[PDB]
Structure formats: structure tokens, C-alpha cells
């Protein structure tokens, strides 16, 4: 009788992502994913391989997308009507 029916109970956590063949470490305090790569590795044409979100969550980037990771990339994970913004940095 009072609830607005916005469906705010969804979860928007990101478990882990893998860029090419390099897994990333996720810190939830600052919403930062850090992916370590070799010094000579080229990060201008990286490929997203997997992205394990929560149940029902949907991210801005899709699996198999080719991204230039020379600078931090913003990501939005949306579940129902809640969202969370992460930043992915490839170092």
C-alpha cells in the first residue's frame, strides 16, 4: 500500500572478470577492478572474455567486446532499478 514497486532488492556485485587471459582483482570499497598485464603487453585492443555478475545483473559491456584499455574504463552494473559504477584499470 506504500511501496513504490521499484524492485530495489537486486544485487549488483561483480565477482570477477577476465580480460584476454588475465584475471582482475576487484575492490568493492572503491569499486575498482585492477588487471595486471606484462610490461610489453599491448592493451589498445583488449578483448573481454568473461564477466561473472550477480543473479539478474546486466553490465554495460558485453562478453566478447573489443575495448581500448589505455585509460580507466567506467562500467555500470544494473539489477532491476539499482545500479553500481565500477572503474576498470589495466596496469
Amino acid at each position: 500500500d506504500f511501496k513504490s514497486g521499484l524492485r530495489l532488492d537486486g544485487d549488483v556485485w561483480v565477482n570477477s572478470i577476465r580480460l584476454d587471459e588475465y584475471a582482475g582483482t576487484v575492490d568493492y570499497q572503491n569499486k575498482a577492478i585492477v588487471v595486471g598485464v606484462p610490461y610489453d603487453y599491448d592493451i589498445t585492443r583488449m578483448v573481454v572474455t568473461e564477466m561473472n555478475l550477480s543473479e539478474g545483473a546486466k553490465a554495460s559491456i558485453a562478453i566478447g567486446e573489443t575495448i581500448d584499455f589505455s585509460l580507466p574504463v567506467s562500467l555500470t552494473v544494473k539489477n532491476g532499478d539499482v545500479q553500481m559504477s565500477y572503474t576498470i584499470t589495466v596496469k
Binding site: F2, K3, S4, L6, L8, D11, K78, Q83
Partner: protein
């Protein structure tokens, strides 16, 4: 049977009083007495405010309660109200003067139950009720709050996505360019620590519950020719609709009277013992619940109490506030006793000596648990406050009465001397720095921090010598003359005593022989009365120049403690600082009694063999030399407040009581009791400083002299601006814009300023009425009491936060649901001003916008009962047996001009619930 028989006396039907099933009989008689206003917030206790014949004085206006001859002013919610024989309201100064020196504001005589001669009886009453919250204030949910914020942002022209509250708005423009909101999304956590998830929280439902009321009474009386006695035990419990608030009361009453030596001597006593334990709601809990936005969760991620974080407004969690306040329980003991001795040397002479006692004890322990609700915290402050209060009032009375029945003349002459003494005291200890943080551990001995001690005491004494003379000729002409010499310890020796006369005339027109043929006119009486009464209800230390050593140990909000302690050495404290004295008030040695003159004219009629009875009263009250606390001129500084006799108040009023009782051919007994009253209040004189500061009205802008008490001065809102052309056409004013409130130019100077204010508020109803219907048919009795008030205006503080955005103390607070229907180009058919983030127009100013029609008519009580037939009762060996189901505050009708709800309680005070009660009465 009226005690005075020649004054303004109202007899209250105790059966219909107990039908309502309220803890406080005063609250039960809310609208059953003409010219008597009872205001009750609805808390678990029956505490209520009583105003008889309107406002008659600037100082305390409480009436005088006299229970079994003992005068008192304490509320009746703390006594037992189910052992009352009769209630009589004496509203005339002439009639009520003889009952005490504090009869300026009316007197209520309560006669308790006594053993009837020659019989023994018992009564057991049980009652269980559920109280439900009806006036649930509608507030914005999460989506509505986001929509309102977006609307305010786009109206002001700022970017809504810059709200920085976690709201992301997808929005655009229509064909006409008016912004529209396609959708919204929210961040999951209100903070960067992921500890406060967003949620849709119904704060009112969270802090409210379904209360339970249980009442059990057991009275037993026994009478005889040599004496009588009565003994009653009562228990009451009420859980409030607000959580963690409750009130329970135990009561035990013992009355007896003994007749000795051929009824020459009589010794009687009436004693009652009461114990009330109460937990009260914190101040402004409803306000906090309305203010806190619905996005804040009740509990955090870790299970701790949820609270505002980030940009959310600084409002405490109401649920946590109630949880922490649940332990602040106070216990109150009341010992109300009386012992009288009566001696009759011969037939006409009576000497009565009465000693009354009223001992009150109050013990409380207040806890301050550390709290941390997001950014709201008290830095882990743990403290305890153990408080104790004592009130001791004792009265001694000596009355000598003589009666003569010579010829057709009846003459009663009474003289009396009365002494009253009241002594009050209180003291409290305060301790800090606790560890376990539980009520069991929190004691001052267990404390390990700074300790404080507070304590005070006061009192006063009253002496009275009164005389009364009643003369009746032919049982047709009645004359009454009373004189009173009253003195109080609150005045100096020169002005200690004062004299008050009163005269009353009455004429029974029906006894005259020139209308003996008027058989239908059963009885007709015309009475008049002119009386003077004295008022001295002021502060005990009123004539003294008070200098107090306020060190500064008392808690003060904002730091304006006005303490007296300075680090004159300059070492940042570290010890007992030097102290001194500060002036609290300026003494006045010329203060005397306030004199209230009352003129009453009444007509009592009874027709058709006492089938249609009624009374019509007209009264004029004039209070002069009113003792008022006038403040300082402003340059006089602190302590400039002083008591002075520079007041004048006037009250003209009409009252009309009607009642019709008759039977029906097929066996229906209908009893109708009607009531209607009206009055007008006016202030005639007032001190200049009081008129300037506007404590009694005018808001400090215009003097209230010549206007009703409490009248307010404000602007006049002539709708709202709907176009830039309208804004330009209207007179220039600061902050004028499209969708803003338009203020009328009263003086037509072309500019809106301070001088564009007028009288807009009048807290005087056009008339207050009540109706009681009692239908009896085949062991079924239905009682139905309605109460209505017409022509009353109310200042709505709820409108302040339900019709405006960012018109409160702080921004981003939760608002009412009706805020959504604000004016906009998309919504032209509206009167609510357009939303905005800044109060440029200064809409918080007092204006006619916040004045609403408070007229209402509510079904105060309904009760359907079934009585077991007498033959079955005798077969089962018990007396009168009855079951009943009742509803209190079930239905109400309000004017369409009232945007809020519950016109009786239109503010943030405690809500009034709907009570559904089932009860039984057994007589054995």
C-alpha cells in the same frame, strides 16, 4: 439535583461517562458540557487540557477539581475514574466561589461512590480493546521522493542528475518544452562503504503498532443505619500506537462513614492510593518520522541501526530513538486522602472539620545510550539521570452551618475557615561514562565519569474565611449572598488579603398562581448572578528580586546556558571555576489579586412532565488587574521579567443544553441530549512590552489588544502566479516568479513588505455542539455520542512540509504525498505552488495559506450492549449482567478546505487512534 440551585451548574451523567470507557473521566466528558473545551492529544494516559468559559486569564487557566471536598489541580488521569457517583461543573463565579479561592477558572466537584443504606453490592467490570492508527500521514516513497526532487530541480533550472543523492534520471522535453521524466534509477548503497543499502521504508508503519488496552475494576459497597463503607480496586493498561510507549495504573479506594450517639456525631474518611507507571514518547517523534526520507533503511548491512549517510539530511532514526527511549520509565505514587468529623449539637446546627492530604511521589531513571546512525552520533555519550520529585498538599477546613424553617422562609447561614499548604521538592543525580550500557548496569555508583546534582524546593500557603447565606421565600424566590476573605503567601503583607462578594437571585416562575393552567409547562426558573472571584495562580517567588548562583551544570541546547563560571586565571579549567550570581527576575512589591467579575443569566425549563428539559445561559466574564509576567524593555537585560497587574480580559458567551426522553408504543426508549455553546474572547488591556513581543498574539507585529487571545497576524496569499504576465502585473515583491505564492498588497503601496500584514487567525470556534442518543429495546442498549465544532481556524504546521519543497529547516527532507500535485505547465489545474530548491519567495512567512478550516464533526463514541435477562441472572445467582462492544473515534467528517487529516489534532503531537472495545459488567 444541583448543589447550588441558583448558578451555572452542569450535571454530568456518570453512566454515559463510563460508557466511553476512558481512563480519564475528564477526557470522557470531552463535549458533554456547554462552554467547556477539553483538548486531548491521545497519549496512553488520559492527560487533557480543560478550558471553562474560554480563556479567562493570562496565567494558568486550569480549573479546580474538588474530590470529596479536597481541592486539587492535578489531572484526573492519575486517579481512578470508575468509582464516581456524580460530576458537577460549576462555571459561575457566584456559585463556585464558596468552594475555594481558586475558582476563577471554574470548579468540578466529583462525588465518589459510597455504600447505599441498607444494602450490600458488588460490581466487576472487564474491558479489552485494540487501538489502531487511523490518521496515517501520507509521505513520499522512494520513487515519489525522486520524482519530487527531479521536478524541483527542473523547475529551478538546475541539472537534476547533479543531485548527488544516488538518483540518476532519464528525462527529456515534450513538444511544448516542459520537462518530463521517463524514468529513474538508484545507486544500491547510499555511501561509499557499502553499509547502507537503499530501501523503501514506511517509517510511520515502522514506528506505529496496534495498541492494547485492558481495564479491570472491582468495587464493593455496604451500607447500614450506623454507617457505610466502600472499597474499589482498579487496574488499567494502555499500550500506545507508537512503539515503546505505554501507561499502566493501579488504584485502590476506601471510603467509610460512621454515625454515633443518635447520629449526633459523624466520622468519615475517603482515601485513595494510585500507582501509575509510564513510558512516554520522545518529543517530536512524529516530526522526525515525517522528516526522515523513506530511502534510509531501518537496519544497516551489519545489523546496526540505519541512518543517514552522505548527502542525506541529518535526521535521527525514529525506530532507534524509540528503542533507546523504551527504558525511560517513570513511576508515580498518589496518596489522596480526607478525614472529616461532623457534630450536630441540635437540629439546625452543624460543625464540620475536614483535613485533606495529597501526597505525590515521582521516581524516574533516564538513560542516554551511545548511538551511531551513519553520520548522526553523540560521540559515544553514555549517561544516567535519576530524578525524584515530591508534592505534599494538605488542607484543613472548619465549617459551621445553621438552618431555619420558620414559617414559609427557609434560611441557611454558613461560615467557614480554610487553610491550604503546598510544598514541592525535587532532586536529581546525573552520571556518565558507563561500559555495559544496559539498564541493570547503569546506576550512578556504577558510573565512572562526571557527576552532577540538581535540586530545588518551593511552596505556598492559603488562608480563607468565607460566609454564605441562602434565603428562600415560598419556595419561589431564592437569594444567595456570599463573601470571601482570601490571603496567600505569594503577596506582600500590605496586599496579602482581598475580599470578593457574590450575589445570586432566582425566581421559580412556575410556582406563581397566574400560570397554574399551563399544565404542559412543568417547571420554569429564571436566575441571575453577579460574583467576584480572586486569582493568584502565579510563580511562588513573584514579589522577590531573585538572584541565583547558576554555575552552569544544567544542560542547554545551543550553548545559551547563561551560566556563571569563568576561567579567570586562563588555564582551560581543570578544577572548580569561580562562580557568582545572576538575576532571574525583578521583584514587585505591589502585586495583588486578579479580580474576575462574572455576570450570569440563566433560564431552566422542563415540559411535558419532565420529558423535555433544558437550560439557556448567557455569561459575561471580565478579568481585571491580571497578574502577568511582563518581559523587560530589552535594554534592561536579563531578569527584566516581572509580575504586574496590568491586564484586562473579556469573555461573552452563550450556552444551550437540551434533552428529550420518552418511550414508544412498541417498547423503544429513546433519550436524546443536545448541547450547543459559543463564546467570544477579547483582550482589553496589556502591558506595552507584552503587546510588543506578542506572547499572547500578534506575532510581535501588531498589538493583540482589542482582539481574541492567541490571534495571529500574517500575510494574505492571493493564489499563485501562473504566468510571467501575472508576475509583472502584480505589485513588485522579492522572489516573485512563475508558480510562486502571490501576496496581496493591503496598503496598495506597490511593494510587498512588513506593512502588508493583517489579522488572519482566530482560534475561536463559531460554535461547539454535542449530541447523545441512547436507545433501549429488548435488552439491547445503543449509545451514540457525536461531537462537532464549527467555525474554527487552525494553523497547519504539517502543510509547511506537505505543500512545499525545501521550506523546512534543512533541505532534502521527506514531504507529504500531496506535494506531487504541485502546479506546473503540465499540471495547470492546481493551487499548490511549484516545487523549488530555494525559498527565494520566503514562503515560510505566516500567511493565510497555512490557515485552514478546522470545522469537524466526529462520532466520539458508539456502544452496543446486550443485558442478560433478569430471570436468567437470578437462575445463575448473579445480579445485572451486561456485555458490550464499543468504538471510539470511529468516524469523522471534515471540511474539504482541510488538506490534512484529524482536524482536532492537526499538528505533530501524539496521534488519536480508533479504539475497538469489548467489555462485560457483572453485579453478582
Amino acid at each position: 439535583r444541583k448543589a447550588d440551585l441558583t448558578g451555572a451548574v452542569s450535571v454530568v451523567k456518570v453512566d454515559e461517562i463510563q460508557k466511553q470507557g476512558e481512563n480519564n473521566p475528564v477526557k470522557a466528558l470531552q463535549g458533554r458540557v456547554p462552554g467547556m473545551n477539553i483538548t486531548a492529544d491521545g497519549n496512553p494516559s488520559g492527560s487533557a487540557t480543560v478550558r471553562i468559559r474560554g480563556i479567562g486569564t493570562l496565567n494558568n487557566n486550569d480549573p479546580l477539581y474538588i474530590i470529596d471536598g479536597v481541592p486539587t489541580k492535578a489531572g484526573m488521569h492519575e486517579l481512578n475514574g470508575n468509582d464516581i457517583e456524580s460530576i458537577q461543573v460549576l462555571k459561575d463565579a457566584a456559585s463556585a466561589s464558596i468552594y475555594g479561592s481558586r475558582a476563577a477558572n471554574g470548579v468540578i466537584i466529583i462525588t465518589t461512590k459510597q455504600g447505599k443504606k441498607g444494602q450490600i453490592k458488588i460490581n466487576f467490570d472487564a474491558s479489552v480493546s485494540a487501538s489502531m492508527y487511523q490518521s496515517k500521514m501520507n509521505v513520499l516513497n522512494t520513487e515519489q521522493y525522486g520524482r519530487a526532487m527531479w521536478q524541483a530541480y527542473v523547475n529551478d533550472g538546475e541539472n537534476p542528475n547533479g543531485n548527488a543523492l544516488g538518483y540518476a534520471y532519464n528525462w527529456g522535453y515534450n513538444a511544448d518544452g516542459n520537462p518530463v521524466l521517463y524514468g529513474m534509477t538508484l545507486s544500491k548503497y547510499l555511501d561509499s562503504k557499502n553499509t547502507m543499502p537503499v530501501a523503501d521504508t514506511d517509517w510511520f508503519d515502522e514506528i506505529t503498532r496496534t495498541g492494547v488496552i485492558q481495564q479491570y475494576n472491582l468495587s464493593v459497597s455496604n451500607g447500614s443505619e450506623k454507617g457505610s463503607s466502600f472499597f474499589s480496586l482498579g487496574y488499567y493498561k494502555n499500550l500506545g500506537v507508537i512503539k515503546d510507549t505505554d501507561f499502566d495504573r493501579f488504584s485502590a479506594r476506601m471510603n467509610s462513614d460512621y454515625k454515633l450517639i443518635d447520629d449526633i456525631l459523624t466520622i468519615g474518611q475517603h482515601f485513595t492510593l494510585n500507582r501509575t507507571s509510564e513510558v512516554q514518547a520522545p518529543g517530536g517523534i512524529i516530526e522526525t518520522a515525517l522528516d526522515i526520507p523513506s530511502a534510509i533503511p531501518v537496519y544497516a548491512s551489519d545489523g546496526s541501526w540505519g541512518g543517514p549517510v552522505g548527502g542525506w539530511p541529518d535526521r535521527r532514526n525514529p525506530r532507534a530513538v524509540l528503542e533507546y527511549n523504551k527504558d525511560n520509565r517513570y513511576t508515580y505514587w498518589r496518596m489522596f486522602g480526607d478525614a472529616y468529623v461532623n457534630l450536630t449539637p441540635f437540629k439546625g446546627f452543624n460543625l464540620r472539620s475536614t483535613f485533606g492530604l495529597d501526597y505525590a511521589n515521582k521516581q524516574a531513571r533516564y538513560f542516554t545510550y551511545p548511538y551511531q546512525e551513519g553520520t548522526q552520533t553523540n560521540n559515544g555519550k553514555s549517561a544516567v539521570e535519576a530524578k525524584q520529585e515530591h508534592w505534599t498538599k494538605w488542607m484543613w477546613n472548619a465549617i459551621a452551618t445553621y438552618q431555619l424553617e420558620v414559617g414559609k422562609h427557609r434560611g441557611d447561614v454558613m461560615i467557614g475557615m480554610e487553610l491550604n499548604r503546598e510544598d514541592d521538592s525535587h532532586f536529581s543525580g546525573y552520571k556518565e561514562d558507563f561500559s555495559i550500557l544496559t539498564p541493570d548496569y547503569m546506576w550512578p555508583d556504577a558510573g565512572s565519569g562526571t557527576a552532577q546534582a540538581y535540586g530545588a524546593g518551593e511552596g505556598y500557603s492559603l488562608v480563607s474565611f468565607f460566609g454564605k447565606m441562602n434565603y428562600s421565600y415560598a419556595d419561589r424566590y431564592l437569594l444567595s449572598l456570599t463573601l470571601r476573605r482570601d490571603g496567600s503567601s505569594r503577596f506582600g503583607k500590605n496586599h496579602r488579603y482581598a475580599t470578593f462578594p457574590s450575589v445570586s437571585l432566582g425566581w421559580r416562575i412556575t410556582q406563581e398562581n397566574f400560570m397554574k393552567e399551563l399544565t404542559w409547562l412543568d417547571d420554569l426558573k429564571l436566575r441571575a448572578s453577579w460574583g467576584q472571584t480572586g486569582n493568584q495562580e502565579i510563580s511562588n517567588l513573584a514579589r522577590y528580586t531573585i538572584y541565583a548562583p547558576n554555575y552552569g551544570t544544567t544542560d542547554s541546547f545551543g550553548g545559551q546556558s547563561y551560566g556563571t563560571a569563568y576561567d579567570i586565571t586562563g588555564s582551560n579549567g581543570g578544577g572548580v571555576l569561580p562562580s557568582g550570581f545572576k538575576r532571574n527576575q525583578i521583584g514587585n512589591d505591589n502585586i495583588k489579586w486578579e479580580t474576575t467579575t462574572q455576570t450570569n443569566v440563566g433560564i431552566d425549563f422542563s415540559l411535558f412532565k419532565q420529558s423535555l428539559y433544558g437550560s439557556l445561559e448567557y455569561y459575561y466574564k471580565k478579568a481585571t488587574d491580571i497578574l502577568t509576567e511582563m518581559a523587560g524593555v530589552g535594554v534592561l537585560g536579563e531578569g527584566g521579567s516581572r509580575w504586574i497587574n496590568s491586564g484586562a480580559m473579556k469573555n461573552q458567551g452563550f450556552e444551550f443544553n437540551l434533552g428529550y426522553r420518552n418511550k414508544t408504543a412498541f417498547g423503544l426508549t429513546y433519550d436524546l441530549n443536545g448541547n450547543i455553546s459559543t463564546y467570544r474572547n477579547e483582550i482589553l488591556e496589556l502591558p506595552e512590552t507584552v503587546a510588543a513581543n506578542g506572547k499572547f498574539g500578534g506575532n510581535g507585529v501588531k498589538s493583540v489588544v482589542g482582539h481574541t487571545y492567541g490571534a495571529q497576524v500574517g500575510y494574505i496569499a492571493d493564489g499563485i502566479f501562473k504566468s510571467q504576465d501575472e508576475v509583472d502585473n502584480h505589485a513588485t515583491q522579492e522572489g516573485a516568479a512563475v508558480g510562486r505564492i502571490r501576496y496581496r498588497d493591503i496598503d496598495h503601496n506597490g511593494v510587498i513588505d512588513e506593512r502588508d500584514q493583517n489579522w488572519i487567525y482566530d482560534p475561536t470556534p463559531s460554535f461547539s455542539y454535542g449530541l447523545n442518543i441512547y436507545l433501549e429495546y429488548k435488552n439491547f442498549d445503543l449509545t451514540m455520542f457525536w461531537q462537532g465544532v464549527q467555525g474554527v481556524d487552525i494553523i497547519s504546521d504539517v502543510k509547511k512540509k506537505s505543500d512545499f519543497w525545501s521550506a523546512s529547516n534543512v533541505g532534502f527532507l521527506n514531504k507529504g504525498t500531496r506535494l506531487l500535485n504541485a502546479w506546473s505547465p503540465t499540471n495547470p489545474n492546481s493551487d499548490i505552488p511549484a516545487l523549488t530548491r530555494s525559498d527565494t519567495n520566503n514562503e515560510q512567512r505566516v500567511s493565510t495559506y497555512f490557515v485552514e478550516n478546522g470545522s469537524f464533526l466526529k462520532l466520539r463514541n458508539i456502544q452496543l450492549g446486550y443485558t442478560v435477562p433478569a430471570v436468567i441472572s437470578k437462575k445463575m445467582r448473579m445480579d445485572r449482567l451486561r456485555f458490550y462492544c464499543s468504538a471510539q473515534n470511529l468516524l469523522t467528517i471534515k471540511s474539504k478546505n482541510f488538506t490534512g487529516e484529524d482536524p482536532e489534532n492537526p499538528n505533530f503531537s501524539y496521534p488519536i487512534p480508533v479504539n475497538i472495545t469489548f467489555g462485560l459488567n457483572i453485579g453478582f
